[PDB]
Design a protein around this ligand. Structure first.
Ligand SMILES: CNCc1ccc(Oc2cccnc2)o1
Length: 330
């Protein structure tokens, strides 16, 4: 089997991407944030504290003839941006782009933090990291990909995120029309539960490429590109007036600037992020200071190849017996 679903930016900045997901019988369609950096499929629901729901579509398990309470199971998660959610667990039929999993754990939120409430466009998350990170207790649950894998034509999924435009998540096949050139595959460590890999270096604009190993994770659920302070300083030094602002929380730059590109290495290959992908717009409405899309990972403890980087590539998440990651230009 295979599946194919369109993923759409939530706003004009590409702050996140949402993909429609069918849950239950009859189908209830929710728009979920597919997150290769976490491993829980959780949704706003009829159980979510009412004051914490503000425009989201909810899953109502009592209206699904295939829903079953997973008795005694609870979940609780917190993300790198400080947000969190928790609740109880059902199993139900879940379909993505025509690919169906029966008995998928659907984690129903009883509580969500303020930034979830405030994001009316995101009805929940669909985790695509390794199932060892799943938070369900006392019986840990598998991701949608893990459950689907044996039925897929090939044990892969691909992320093809758009810049200010829709894109695609495919399961079970590689669309050879969706990229240019060849796909370069690189090793993955699953020891931390992430799609963790090592980039071979970087370049700023037209500058010479610096060969240096940068360990990090491929994370569709993180908006920006978080890299070591040395790398980030070298980038922003090329932008007149850019500076790190403690009050804003990162590098800012004049909105009047045209930004240089940023290149990252994948083995001997190179992925070029155009400068415009690095502009996240005014820090506050009407400001002429703009927020940068490349930020320091110092104090995160890991480098993160988030959407800024991934949307410059066609990315293969290869879940074969030894997982790997592939990147192609597009
Ligand atoms: C804006 N915070 C709530 C929210 C929306 C989407 C996500 O999910 C995230 C956020 C950061 C990293 N990984 C997943 O959180």
């Amino acid at each position: 089997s295979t599946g194919s679903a369109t993923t759409t930016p939530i706003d004009s900045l590409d702050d996140a991407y949402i993909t429609p997901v069918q849950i239950g019988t009859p189908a209830q369609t929710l728009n979920l944030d597919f997150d290769t950096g976490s491993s829980d499929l959780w949704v706003f629901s009829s159980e979510t504290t009412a004051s914490e729901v503000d425009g989201q579509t909810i899953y109502t398990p009592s209206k699904s003839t295939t829903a079953k309470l997973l008795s005694g199971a609870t979940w609780s998660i917190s993300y790198g941006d400080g947000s969190s959610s928790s609740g109880d667990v059902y199993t139900d039929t879940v379909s993505v782009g025509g690919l169906t999993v029966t008995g998928q754990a659907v984690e129903s939120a009883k509580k969500v933090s303020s930034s979830f409430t405030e994001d009316s466009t995101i009805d929940g998350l669909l985790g695509l990291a390794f199932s060892t990170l799943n938070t369900v207790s006392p019986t840990q649950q598998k991701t949608f990909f893990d459950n689907a894998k044996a039925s897929l034509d090939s044990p892969v999924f691909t992320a093809d995120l758009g810049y200010h435009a829709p894109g695609t998540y495919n399961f079970g096949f590689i669309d050879t029309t969706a990229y240019t050139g060849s796909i370069t595959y690189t090793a993955v460590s699953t020891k931390q539960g992430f799609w963790e890999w090592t980039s071979t270096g970087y370049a700023v604009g037209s500058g010479t490429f610096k060969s240096t190993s940068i360990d990090g994770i491929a994370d569709t659920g993180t908006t920006l590109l978080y890299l070591p302070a040395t790398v980030v300083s070298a980038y922003w030094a090329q932008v007149s007036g850019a500076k790190s602002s403690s009050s804003v929380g990162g590098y800012v730059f004049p909105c009047s600037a045209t930004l240089p590109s940023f290149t990252f290495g994948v083995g001997s290959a190179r992925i070029v992020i155009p400068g415009d992908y690095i502009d996240f717009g005014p820090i506050s409405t009407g400001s002429s200071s703009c927020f940068g899309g490349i930020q320091s990972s110092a104090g995160i403890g890991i480098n993160i190849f988030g959407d800024v980087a991934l949307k410059a590539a066609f990315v293969v998440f290869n879940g074969a017996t030894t997982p790997t990651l592939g990147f192609a230009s597009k």
